[PDB]
Amino acid sequence: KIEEGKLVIWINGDKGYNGLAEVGKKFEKDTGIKVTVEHPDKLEEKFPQVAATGDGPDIIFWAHDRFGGYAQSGLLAEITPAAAFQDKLYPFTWDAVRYNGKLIAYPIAVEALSLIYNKDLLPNPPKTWEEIPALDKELKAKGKSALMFNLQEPYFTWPLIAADGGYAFKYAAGKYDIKDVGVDNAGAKAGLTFLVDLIKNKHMNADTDYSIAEAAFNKGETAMTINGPWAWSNIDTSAVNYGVTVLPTFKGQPSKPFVGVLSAGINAASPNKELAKEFLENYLLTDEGLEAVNKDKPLGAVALKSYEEELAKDPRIAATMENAQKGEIMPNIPQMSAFWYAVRTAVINAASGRQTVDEALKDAQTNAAAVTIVKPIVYGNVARYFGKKREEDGHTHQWTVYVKPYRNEDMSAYVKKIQFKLHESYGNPLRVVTKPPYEITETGWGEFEIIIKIFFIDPNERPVTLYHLLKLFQSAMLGKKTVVSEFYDEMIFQDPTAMMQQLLTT
Amino acid sequence: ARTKQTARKST
Amino acid sequence: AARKSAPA
Numbered sequence: 001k002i003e004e005g006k007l008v009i010w011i012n013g014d015k016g017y018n019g020l021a022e023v024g025k026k027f028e029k030d031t032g033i034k035v036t037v038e039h040p041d042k043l044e045e046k047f048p049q050v051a052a053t054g055d056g057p058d059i060i061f062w063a064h065d066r067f068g069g070y071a072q073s074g075l076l077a078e079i080t081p082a083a084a085f086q087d088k089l090y091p092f093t094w095d096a097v098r099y100n101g102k103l104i105a106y107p108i109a110v111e112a113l114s115l116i117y118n119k120d121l122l123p124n125p126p127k128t129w130e131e132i133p134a135l136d137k138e139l140k141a142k143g144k145s146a147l148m149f150n151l152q153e154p155y156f157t158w159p160l161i162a163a164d165g166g167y168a169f170k171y172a173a174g175k176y177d178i179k180d181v182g183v184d185n186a187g188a189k190a191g192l193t194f195l196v197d198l199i200k201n202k203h204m205n206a207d208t209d210y211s212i213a214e215a216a217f218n219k220g221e222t223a224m225t226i227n228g229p230w231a232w233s234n235i236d237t238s239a240v241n242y243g244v245t246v247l248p249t250f251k252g253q254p255s256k257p258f259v260g261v262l263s264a265g266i267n268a269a270s271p272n273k274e275l276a277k278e279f280l281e282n283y284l285l286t287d288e289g290l291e292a293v294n295k296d297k298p299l300g301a302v303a304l305k306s307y308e309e310e311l312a313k314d315p316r317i318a319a320t321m322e323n324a325q326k327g328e329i330m331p332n333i334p335q336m337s338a339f340w341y342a343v344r345t346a347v348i349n350a351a352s353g354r355q356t357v358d359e360a361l362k363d364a365q366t367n368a369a370a371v372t373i374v375k376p377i378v379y380g381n382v383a384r385y386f387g388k389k390r391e392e393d394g395h396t397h398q399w400t401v402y403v404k405p406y407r408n409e410d411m412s413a414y415v416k417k418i419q420f421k422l423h424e425s426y427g428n429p430l431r432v433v434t435k436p437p438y439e440i441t442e443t444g445w446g447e448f449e450i451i452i453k454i455f456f457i458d459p460n461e462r463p464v465t466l467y468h469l470l471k472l473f474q475s476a477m478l479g480k481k482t483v484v485s486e487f488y489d490e491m492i493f494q495d496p497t498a499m500m501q502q503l504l505t506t
Numbered sequence: 507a508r509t510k511q512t513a514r515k516s517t
Numbered sequence: 518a519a520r521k522s523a524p525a
């Protein structure tokens with residue numbers, strides 16, 4: 001469970017979590033409510049896996065692209081900012097956090113990648129990707145390199161891939177078409193081919209990650225990096241005099257960075273929704289709160305009009321907005337995680353020779369379009385100990401073995417029947433339930449494996465089989481209290497029929 | 507359909 | 518004879 005009377009906030013370790021901690025103390029000084037800020041690794045993965053079972057933080061911070069998928073999986077409370085509060089942020093930022101006409105997060109700040117150049121090593125930054133090899137040669141002469149950035153995260157390579165016609169999903173008729181992916185067009189191939197040729201020609205190194213690229217640029221070892229506003233603090237700390245500028249063009253085209261809106265969502269499972277609204281609207285999303293975060297790690301172009309205007313004069317923020325303007329706002333649709341996973345695969349493989357560009361992107365094109373629907377379920381048994389052992393048969397317990405949907409939905413929409421196979425010591429051990437609740441009540445003396453087979457109204461949709469050890473004895477101060485052994489799992493429907501997609505989606 | 511690659515979680 | 522079990 002999420003502890004009440006406290007706020008737990010998750011934010012990525014590249015963002016100003018110390019400055020958020022300061023807003024945290026401010027909130028605690030005022031309200032007596034303890035705020036704890038954590039930066040767990042792979043939180044874009046950790047939040048959905050914990051929040052699935054109603055655990056994790058009260059507040060989750062990530063780029064808005066993940067939030068449609070979070071809200072789709074029921075992981076987010078719809079936020080209730082008054083009209084007055086909405087006027088204080090840019091309408092553009094609210095759009096990034098609107099899924100199915102519902103606001104599902106508080107926008108914080110607009111992030112785009114820029115080219116970051118050591119002004120000493122390189123007074124005049126390259127206007128093109130193409131001139132970079134010749135620059136890395138002139139610089140390899142002096143024991144330097146031209147360019148190092150994170151090749152492990154497709155976010156950083158995507159601007160190049162998008163430059164000559166790569167796209168995620170083509171927007172049309174007021175929605176993104178998840179069948180029309182632009183990952184394996186001539187544009188996308190030319191961009192990823194150029195990245196691969198930079199590696200093959202030792203202008204760059206395929207294992208270069210965030211830490212290596214950053215550490216390299218901040219020690220003055222590499223003339224350029226590609227990174228977002230958050231990276232500026234560590235460069236400020238370093239001796240490096242740096243410019244933030246427009247990304248190089250590729251084949252004469254602007255590099256097109258995916259534009260993220262750093263967004264703050266409230267956990268659906270939070271007992272502290274009012275406290276999270278208070279903290280976000282009235283402490284964080286103020287000039288004082290954003291300054292406290294921004295001075296730790298720059299946010300970019302903040303959603304809050306008042307503070308955006310104060311910061312707008314900074315040329316690093318103008319370059320960010322220039323790159324953003326050449327880029328595309330990321331969709332927030334659930335399919336973005338599939339797209340990102342697919343392109344991470346293609347870029348890493350291609351970059352490390354494991355695949356060619358054409359294989360990698362052909363694979364990524366198919367993976368980015370792959371519809372995966374998730375039905376979270378709970379299954380197991382409740383078992384109530386009788387007053388005393390019935391001697392007739394020797395049974396000690398009444399038990400119910402069950403499968404139910406995790407979230408209160410109508411499982412019968414797509415489930416035709418659930419079969420529970422009991423031990424041979426039961427007559428008609430193959431018990432079938434065609435209608436909810438999907439459960440069998442029985443009496444017995446023993447624990448045995450029950451096999452549970454779930455059937456779908458589309459019979460082509462392969463049945464799911466579960467294994468449950470019926471439990472009667474937990475063994476623990478609980479006495480006549482009903483013993484519980486239930487488990488959360490997720491049923492996964494990969495590219496199901498439109499019939500099945502319809503019943504699977506309420 | 508299949509279950510998740512990741513283990514079931516005790517509630 | 519499938520495995521059934523109880524503690525007594």
Ligand SMILES: OC[C@H]1O[C@H](O[C@H]2[C@H](O)[C@@H](O)[C@@H](O)O[C@@H]2CO)[C@H](O)[C@@H](O)[C@@H]1O
Nearest residue numbers: 012014063065066111153154155260340
């Ligand atoms: O690399 C794929 C990744 O891209 C974006 O994540 C960014 C994030 O937006 C930035 O705030 C910063 O944290 O860098 C990340 C890249 O390592 C997407 O928002 C994310 O969903 C996606 O997986």
